[PDB]
Amino acid sequence: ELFNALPQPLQQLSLALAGEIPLTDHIFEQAASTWHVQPRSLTYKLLDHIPFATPVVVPPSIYHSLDWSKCFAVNQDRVERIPTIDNPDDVYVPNSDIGPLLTSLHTIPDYGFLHPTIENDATTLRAERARCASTFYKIASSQARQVKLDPIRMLGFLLLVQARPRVPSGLVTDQPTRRDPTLSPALHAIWQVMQYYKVAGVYYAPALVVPSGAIWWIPPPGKRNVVSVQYLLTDLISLAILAHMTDMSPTLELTGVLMYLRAASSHSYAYTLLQMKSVFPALSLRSMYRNKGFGGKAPAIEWTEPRSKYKFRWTGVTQLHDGLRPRSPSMDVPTLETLAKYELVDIGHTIIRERNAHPQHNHDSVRFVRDVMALTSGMYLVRQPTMSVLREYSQVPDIKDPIPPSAWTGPIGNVRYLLPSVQGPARHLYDTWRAAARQIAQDPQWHDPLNQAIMRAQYVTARGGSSASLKFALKVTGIVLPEYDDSKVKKSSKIYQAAQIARIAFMLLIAAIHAEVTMGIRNNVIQQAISAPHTLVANYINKHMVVTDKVIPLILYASTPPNTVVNVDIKACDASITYNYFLSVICGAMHEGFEVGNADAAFMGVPSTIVSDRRSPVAPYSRPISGLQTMVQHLADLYAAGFRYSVSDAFSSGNKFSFPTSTFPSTEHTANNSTMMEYFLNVHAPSHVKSASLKRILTDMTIQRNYVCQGDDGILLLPHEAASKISADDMNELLTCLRDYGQLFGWNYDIDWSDTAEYLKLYALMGCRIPNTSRHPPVGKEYAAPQTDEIWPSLIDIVIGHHLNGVTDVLNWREWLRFSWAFACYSSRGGYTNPRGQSFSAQYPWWTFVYLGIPPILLPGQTPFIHSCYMPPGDQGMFSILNGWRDWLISHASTTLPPLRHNHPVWGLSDVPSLLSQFGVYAGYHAAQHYRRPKPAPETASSDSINQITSDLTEYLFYDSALKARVMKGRYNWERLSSSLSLNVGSRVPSLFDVPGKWVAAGRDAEKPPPSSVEDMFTSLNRCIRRPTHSFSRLLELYLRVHVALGESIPLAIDPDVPQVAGADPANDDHWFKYTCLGDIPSATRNYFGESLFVGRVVSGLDVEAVDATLLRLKILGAPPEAFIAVLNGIGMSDSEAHQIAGRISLANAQLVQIARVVHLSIPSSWMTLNTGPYIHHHAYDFKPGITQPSAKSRDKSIWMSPILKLLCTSYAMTVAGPVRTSIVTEIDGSAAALSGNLRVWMRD
């Protein structure tokens, strides 16, 4: 059997994780070091223990391999472009073996790496062959790197979860699992593949994974190590996991496997999958319910006031019928024919046979749609960077109606105006952009110095950026010499550094007109600042424009079978904006709108030059243009020469380039979406659609209503003459007049109408959101780099991003929670070996994952699986566990450990901090608060870290216009106030002196932190484990006074048999409860949620919720009005603008969540997709005057006190794993005015 085949430590853990033994730190530690010590290939032996009955037979043609030498030609001078076999797009990877080009690594024999000799040739002398070999090894060991860890390890956790059956929890609606590991086609095809890699009884994995990349095993003579098998195992593992967290039927699962075995067998594994990526949502999600007899329940959502403030409201239940079926035809004819060419038709007829057995909209039907959509291979697809640029970036759009050259005026310097005669879609684009440019040019908003410092903060990216080259190898065109390091400089050309390099003349200088030399360097801060009036106008078109309340509510309303919905996705909206049509009308219109401004007004540091103006043939005359028009003359000299790309990929060896194209990797190809559809519904489609009925429908349709634009995506929802839509006459003739409308100016519209709704990759069928589990797979994670970046505790943040991202999805939790726990444990045994010294290690105890968000399986006093996966992370969850069993550990430590002599007011004389320290709670509490990334070493050239000149002069870019005085008035008037009078913080309130330090902390975050720093991380980590402070935190020790007891479940928010979310059916215990007790559509009252944050305009270096808390955190205390203006001057706001905020910030009319933010009680990301708005302020009492005690009566202080107490209640109410229920503060240990005073001691810090 599988269970008695495992190692002693693992058998105990599998038992422990399953629920039989609450796991202790000894169970956790021995199971952690059992993984890292034993060889990784040994967990493939466990496949040989389970018997198998699935009829999946792998072909012997998997291991055949067309060699890489035919499929990796250096067509250009140093470009390893793969010569496609049969296509332009067959370039993902070749299904070759790396048999010859491997030399055995001496540490792990029979596991080789790139040949030492071959690598040298590529670096020194190109070997059309000696570099084509190197670009094949660094792709196949990078395509086998798109994975969270070793996938052989991720399979090893699934055998732990399937080692034992789960202990029955005791809940009524707890279904034991139906999945049998002896009946699974995924991990039977793994073992059938793994027979080929067998040298005398032992298994060799074909590619052990190292943070530099994969290490491929060297086959003995006669066998081939084909690179596709490692990806064929990475998908088959990811199917073996997604069919044990989904309860996928064995027959349905079998079809998915045959999809993979055909793909490994053909020439390219990666390529085959891509051509059949949409072959599985089309069979099921797109085509559900077309048979007669359709009819279940579906929600009845309303659009309240449609024009703006999309505020959908869940109002009722519809009863479906044979009418309002999906009018669109099924995808069986089209996808199956496409499917037919790869010889899997039989896997198409199986899924069609299953789908015809779900005729009506049930829980079982919409669970089936998630089962088929979890069959698409969610692995990422690495392609050579040089090769990728050729096939993606450079595709010039085809225009079926160009602007004639006699439709422009004469030139005015560089740009041209459009003539008034030429109507069409070009005229509406010109008129909607010129009218918006003549609103921006007459505006007081962008002349304020704080708005300038915000705009300079958007250019140096606080998040993102790319590998820009430099500036002074591009300023040899100019005369301006750039700044150099005063002291040793660490940051290399960081977007921030570019600002640092030239900050002498407001981050730009009309002496710096050499911004057009080498742009967009990616595999510029002065081109982002030349493009100021291009995204200033695009942020006026995008006035009407989050996912949780502006998309999730929508997708649902659009999917209901009243209104039929066309979803419009534009393919390559980047590569459709060209200067031949789109970007010349834009720069033409902005230069026309920018004349209603004062024609001598400089903008953003660019003066007001003159221009030729030759647009009249009888009188050309020099004309002074404005400052904003001067940027347009340099935008038109930049957009017309395209964008340079200095792509130099590290995958291919010598591949360096200089690439010009017309694609930008900001919000304009978002902004052009609405105005080009506004012309469709009003002018173009009523002009010709050849249908009397069709024309009638369009006339009553606008674009503010009936269209929701975002990015390149968008949903077009028709007027209410809806379900009654003739698909032959109306909805297909509306589509061909749409798809030919976009082709007359290059926009390749890709319409795919069906009665689901796709909106930025969140599908929903019939009022029920369907999560795509292959969008973020369990084993898969992109990296997009040769060498990765994994020190050691950067695996823990992956695990919490692996667990919580699977629970936004309605993945079954019990199979999932156990899997997450097993995976979490592996991520607790780490190490670091010095290059010239001793090796090191660390051991995170469990309870360091309970503090991070993973709920525990079995505490020592309970029954397993009663802590829900919606438990909030941190102190809200550490309270909501300790509030659960405080009646247990007090009774247990009264009959074990001796009583303490003094009294802890939360407990009694029963001594539980010496019991909590025995269970390892404090060692888990102080471990996760300890930092995880290695600190950049504190090394400078001079002044003991002071007088740094790259940090002190990034402030010069942020201090233009005597704003510098306001942040100096802020840090003076606050330090005069706080450190001597009262409210003495000791640390800085979030002022503007932190963010030039924050650009360096996000800039000096260099790779390879030296061995001096990561050893210092390992030593500091080991001290906070061995001597974790016995005392808890200062917030948690005050939260534990509250005794929260919860009553019977609250009146429901959804008739709990309409299925709202992809399988949160009674197979799932709590996910069906928390999605029907609470509702979806998370729009609530304006006294709870309504997105205030009473500052709004942050400087982008500051957290918005750090200002919003500390503006409230003073108002809780006895703050003088001076302490509000001194903090708000620290952000840089003017004294007049700070005063209007200093009077506003009252607890009366303050969002309930904001008050909770003061003491760091946040609504977490786990239930952001839930309607916890009315739950907190209706139910979850802070005082129910008959159950509660009069001792816990927050009297006068209740305005700010109640929010905290209502969020401690709902933290306990979502942590337990049943229906949500009314949670009452029973009593507080010590009175509530003796706790409200206790928080105000902490709120002075």
Binding site: D700, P719, H720, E721, S724
Partner: protein, 49 residues
């Protein structure tokens, strides 16, 4: 409701695809047969007594 809602326009927009064909005139054809078959059941029963 909508802001500028002209309701006789809104109903003519809405009630147009319900009078598109013989939806109403199937109940009339069903009613005549349920009258002839009712007398022919009343006649044929009361003639055999």
């Amino acid at each position: 409701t909508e802001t500028n809602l002209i309701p006789s326009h809104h109903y003519g927009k809405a009630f147009a695809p319900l009078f598109a064909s013989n939806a109403m005139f199937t109940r009339n054809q069903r009613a005549v047969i349920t009258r002839e078959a009712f007398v022919c059941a009343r006649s044929a029963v009361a003639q055999c007594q």
